[model samples]
Target: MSDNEDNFDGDDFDDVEEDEGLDDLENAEEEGQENVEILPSGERPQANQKRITTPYMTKYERARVLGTRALQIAMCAPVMVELEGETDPLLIAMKELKARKIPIIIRRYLPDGSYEDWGVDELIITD
Candidate 1:
């Protein structure tokens, strides 16, 4: 079995808001590689695209949800499985989250070696 298989946990999580940035995504695809980096503040454009909320849901309201914080994006409902693993999982997830308009937070790790919040903006579902 692939090491990634073990990481593909089916544990259910909430839904997150998605932003309609399809045009940017498409542009990135056409432009090819774009130098980008994950800024400590969780925003970037140097890369291909700056992640936006999905068109389905609204922006995150609360600061914390669940037990994750700092890059931990959750959803209100189960995302459309078929939607993921496509050309762009980020787009699919953002779209699903936008549609759901649940709760999404950035999973931020505390200094105590423990987690504080579960960010639900974008998740990397790869195998």
Candidate 2:
């Protein structure tokens, strides 16, 4: 792999969320080179697009789900995957995620006053 690669995938997390005061390189900011790319849930700007034809799970969301699921498991929620007496919530979360049984959905929003709603298994995990 190239050492100089952008380690973070190309999802536009920089988009303004439920706000009207944000947009890249506008009049207020001084000499900035920034943009909001509209890509799939896991990755950027491209032609022939209508809210991401093939949405993929994001690494950010991956970690986020793990955190949530781990917390739930720690708090005595039901486990979805079998284990060999592993007590770590994080590990259990990973196992649940691998089994695609986390049972969550990602609602990625856009600055254009709209959002995309897709289910958990609907998005394939890369992490």
Candidate 3:
């Protein structure tokens, strides 16, 4: 209970290789897993799943919208927003996107082989 315990006592507990009587491991040289399904994954319509990542259009989607609308604008399609000294098709298209004046459905693909669709109403508009 005090310095009265300084005598070096050798440990009596030693690690020994022990085994139970039963062998549960079956390593059949080429046995495949059982009950695994062969799934050919594809898009499924989501009922309640929202966008998996962002609250708004990502750079990839934004670029796609810009290019598509720029082509339309160059072809004399009328813009939804009033032009602000903006003659560049790309510029006007970006502005239109920011103003939520352009209608589009952004596709949000997830790694789980499912996806969600985003409309202008659900997207956050920011330049």
Candidate 4:
């Protein structure tokens, strides 16, 4: 035979683990770019983005304002309007919201660390 099987060591293959390369491949795949990105301080925002100030409130926002106002009314706060026969504080708060007379401001937070302060009048105005 021509030196083909002279230095072949089968025990060396047995001593080494088979999954070592697989583990490294798996770790390399895991080291790829993740979905979340954490930016450094003072250099995050590339531009000075303007705040999104909308003239309308969403359903959840409206509900939250009404709920808090109702709670305040239930806790002896003065009603904004004179109700004829409505005894429910929630109903009173709803009526006040519909009438655009609630003395409340809706502050909306943006993703870029900015916010907008919208009033009830601005949110409910038809024009």
Candidate 5:
């Protein structure tokens, strides 16, 4: 019997074409993990300036305990906790998520189409 054996190299499995754009980036892309990027615009003019609120939901258990409350707090939470009156909780939390390399997404609630993308933070609710 003839046998053909080969060692496994990670590159061998990818086998992607040269022209692949996003496809090439897919595997290299972060999955709820990676370095965070900071940008300043609009009301916020400083990079990584968003303030983070404590007592955030850690996982499914926290979610269950907090229930809709978490969302409520998130809605009002400022990106800069140190600031007052003019603080933007949304921006704060988002920046915090990015700083911690948390995977975040901005989306709407559907029905009314109110959109707010925030970090899911890769809490790994499942055991």
Candidate 6:
């Protein structure tokens, strides 16, 4: 062996290499953890945002119902309530919905396959 190679300690290089490998592994693991919310170390319960449920169908639900009602009216189906000024089928359907004169139920299902039904009488429709 050469004199330069004789002075080289493999053990010294091994410790440094092992430490660098561990540091790289830790950095790679940290890089994979974006967008994960880390909570403080505590036993307290985390605060949950409250969902707003009003005494009416959601806007999406209302739009869908109005569309269906308008289609029914366009097909010459009977209107649930009489309207004096509205001649358009869509507008008459909207008026009927706003007055809550239609006897129908809105059905919703959850992820667990359970279902809920809300009566039109209990819902507030907007103009």
Q: Write candidate 2's Cα lDDT for 23-50 as tens digits.
A: 2324443331212222223222332233
Tell me which of candidates 1 and 6 scores higher on TM-score. 6
TM-score between model 1 and native? 0.23
Using TM-score as the measure, the top candidate is: 4
Can you give the lDDT of residue 71 in candidate 1? 22
Q: Across residues 39-94, which tens digit of lDDT does each residue of candidate 3 receive?
A: 11222456434646356645445445556556655565344554333446566566
Candidate 1 runs further than 4 Å off:
1-78, 81-85, 101-106, 110-115, 119-127
lDDT of 6 by residue, 73-127 (tens): 5665345654333345566456655665654434333444343334243453431
Give candidate 3 regions above 4 Å deviation: 1-53, 82-88, 98-103, 110-112
Q: Is candidate 1 or candidate 3 better by lDDT?
A: 3
Estimate every model's Cα lDDT from 0 to 1. 0.30, 0.48, 0.47, 0.46, 0.30, 0.42
TM-score of each: 0.23, 0.42, 0.42, 0.43, 0.18, 0.38
Best by lDDT: 2
Q: How accurate is candidate 6 locally (lDDT)?
A: 0.42
Stretch of 10 with least lDDT, candidate 4: 32-41
Which one wins by TM-score: 2 or 4? 4
lDDT of model number 2:
0.48
Q: Report residue 39 deviation for candidate 1 (angstroms).
A: 20
Could you tell me the lDDT of residue 53 within candidate 6?
Answer: 26
Once superposed on the true structure, which residue ranges of model 6 sit more than 4 Å away at CA? 1-56, 82-89, 100-102, 110-114, 122-127
User: What would the TM-score be for candidate 4 when compared with the true structure?
Assistant: 0.43
